[PDB]
Amino acid sequence: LLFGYPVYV
Amino acid sequence: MIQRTPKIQVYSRHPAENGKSNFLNCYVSGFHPSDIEVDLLKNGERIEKVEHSDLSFSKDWSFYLLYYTEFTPTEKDEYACRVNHVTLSQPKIVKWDRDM
């Protein structure tokens, strides 16, 4: 199951 | 920018027995960037239905792919893989040896 929060560099 | 050469292995899924169906494989690994051109050849000509795995990479971030086609070996037909990548000055051809 994938991680569900956006992360941006 | 990083560029790493593909390692290439061309082999069958099962031990080759003439007259019996099998899959011819060409595994390319350890390369970077991910654009690579990989063909499988039967007596020099290019085989048209060749499939490949989905692009993945190793712990060191270098990429790997398995290309494969169904085939039935004979005593006289020759097979090989031809790969192109930014690291290769010309298309590298590796012949299928039944014993590697």
Partner: protein, 275 residues
């Protein structure tokens, strides 16, 4: 024994040749189970293992939603990094991201991972404590500070200690015939005349799962590491792996050499001899 779950993501910019290429794949141990490819027609997360094919529409619609969200943060990322490195708009660049977890033999949480690479070199990594970050570059420091301020690690620790481990062992019991299997290597040797005074002895291990294996040659029970040609473990294409190890033997010395095979699928390790 231990098990792991991993997601690998690759985005490559195609300047002029459209939107960036994004590919996502998921693995449990050595078995791939899902994929998403940006250039594919479906635009959905797809099954790649028989045991995941019976998950419901909630699973598939939810993962398709989240994988496409990942696609889009990576396409913003490509611009952001081009900016951090003050690079041209004309060139293709690669971002890779991996995250996942490991459980031990008791199936309890053991390690968690979250890391990025830009154009094939390490960019930023969550450390083992899952509270700090490793950033090597000066550009990578923007990202490090950003994620510090925004408390990114706290969200990640929470997922890696909870959800990741939970679904890994859901996958483990739901795919038990595949994932809790072990296929033992089918072994054999070949002998090829190199010359009048030398021949190659090649030791084969075929049809084994998982991919981890140790294949070595010995000459009178001692180390032959520098003298062995050993290929990289390769996929047969049917979910098992293959590997070989070869030594060039002086004629009349075949009896001195032994091939040794270690694999968790073997009740005990093999010692093979040409005779």
């Amino acid at each position: 024994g231990s098990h792991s779950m991993r997601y690998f993501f690759t985005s490559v910019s195609r300047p002029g040749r459209g939107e960036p290429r994004f590919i996502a794949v998921g693995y449990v141990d050595d078995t791939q189970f899902v994929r998403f490819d940006s250039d594919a027609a479906s635009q959905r997360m797809e099954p790649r293992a028989p045991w995941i094919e019976q998950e419901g529409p909630e699973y598939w619609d939810g993962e398709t939603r989240k994988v496409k969200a990942h696609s889009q943060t990576h396409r913003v990322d490509l611009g952001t990094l081009r900016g951090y490195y003050n690079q041209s708009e004309a060139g293709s660049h690669t971002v890779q991201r991996m995250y996942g977890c490991d459980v031990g033999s008791d199936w309890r949480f053991l390690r968690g991972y979250h890391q990025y690479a830009y154009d094939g070199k390490d960019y930023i990594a969550l450390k083992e404590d899952l509270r700090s970050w490793t950033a090597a570059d000066m550009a990578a420091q923007t990202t490090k500070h950003k994620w510090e301020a925004a408390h990114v690690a706290e969200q990640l620790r929470a997922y890696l200690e909870g959800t990741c481990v939970e679904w890994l062992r859901r996958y483990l019991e739901n795919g038990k015939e595949t994932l809790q299997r072990t296929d033992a290597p089918k072994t054999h040797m070949t002998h090829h005349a190199v010359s009048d005074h030398e021949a190659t002895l090649r030791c084969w291990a075929l049809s084994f799962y998982p991919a981890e294996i140790t294949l070595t040659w010995q000459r009178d029970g001692e180390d032959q590491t520098q003298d062995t040609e050993l290929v990289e473990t390769r996929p047969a294409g049917d979910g098992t792996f293959q590997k070989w190890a070869a030594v060039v033997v002086p004629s009349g010395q075949e009896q001195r050499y032994t091939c040794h095979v270690q694999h968790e699928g073997l009740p005990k390790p093999l010692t093979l001899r040409w005779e």
